[PDB]
Design a protein around this ligand. Structure first.
Ligand SMILES: *[C@H](CS(=O)(=O)c1ccccc1)[C@H](CCc1ccccc1)NC(=O)[C@H](CC(C)C)NC(=O)N1CCOCC1
Length: 217
């Protein structure tokens, strides 16, 4: 495996989105993972509709729109629905709306999704290097995360109880310190232009490898 990978370098990552006051973190983490698979399979990069998931992947999938959801069951909705629209045709409103999915604007499909072994950062590493960006959950309930500016994030108060859905788009080291490159969904003004580098190999820090999954077209 390479010492480091950054999928943004291979044009597999779209621009950082801003969720607003709607807890759709799980939806953004999900489309972000599918967006990279789309590029790898069709050579094209298009941001997919997080609003589609918030409005359509609901109760049946155990999701609650602006009140929370799961990346795994969001993938399941795309597989069931036979597709998901592009962001351009189905824009983000940061609100719970009626499902207005239109197959005419389908921008991608999903055939399956894989769930990785609990707490195994070594397996997450292989997946990120060989498959693509992986959707993960992390404990982001500490002011230090909200206030993150740069560097490798390590919060001694972090726990395994995850509550935020984000996307791991790479890994590497910063003058030797190992980290996971994570795409957040709180706009460009959060952390490093929207990303945060979290501690890697420090005992499943903040639950980073607790609930990981990735889709496949
Ligand atoms: C996204 C996380 S967030 O809102 O960006 C955030 C902000 C600040 C600090 C930490 C996280 C959502 C929030 C859902 C929510 C929770 C409580 C009140 C209102 C909204 N988180 C989720 O969707 C998580 C993601 C998983 C990876 C854990 N799931 C989730 O909250 N639920 C599962 C489905 O039932 C409802 C709760």
């Amino acid at each position: 495996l390479p010492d480091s990978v950054d999928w943004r370098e291979k044009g597999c990552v779209t621009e950082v989105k801003y969720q607003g006051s709607c807890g759709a973190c799980w939806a953004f983490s999900a489309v972000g993972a599918l967006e990279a698979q789309l590029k790898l399979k069709t050579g094209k990069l298009v941001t997919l509709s997080a609003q589609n998931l918030v409005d359509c992947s609901t109760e049946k999938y155990g999701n609650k729109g602006c009140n929370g959801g799961f990346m795994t069951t969001a993938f399941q909705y795309i597989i069931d629905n036979k597709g998901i629209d592009s962001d351009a045709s189905y824009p983000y409103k940061a609100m719970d709306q009626k499902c207005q999915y239109d197959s005419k604007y389908r921008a991608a499909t999903c055939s399956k999704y894989t769930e990785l072994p609990y707490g195994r950062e070594d397996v997450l590493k292989e997946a990120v290097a060989n498959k693509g960006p992986v959707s993960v959950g992390v404990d982001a309930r500490h002011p230090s995360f909200f206030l993150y500016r740069s560097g490798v994030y390590y919060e001694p108060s972090c726990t395994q109880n995850v509550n935020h859905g984000v996307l791991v788009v790479g890994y590497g080291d910063l003058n030797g310190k190992e980290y996971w490159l994570v795409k957040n969904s709180w706009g460009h003004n959060f952390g490093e232009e929207g990303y945060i580098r979290m501690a890697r190999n420090k005992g499943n820090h903040c639950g980073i490898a607790s609930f990981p999954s990735y889709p496949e077209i």
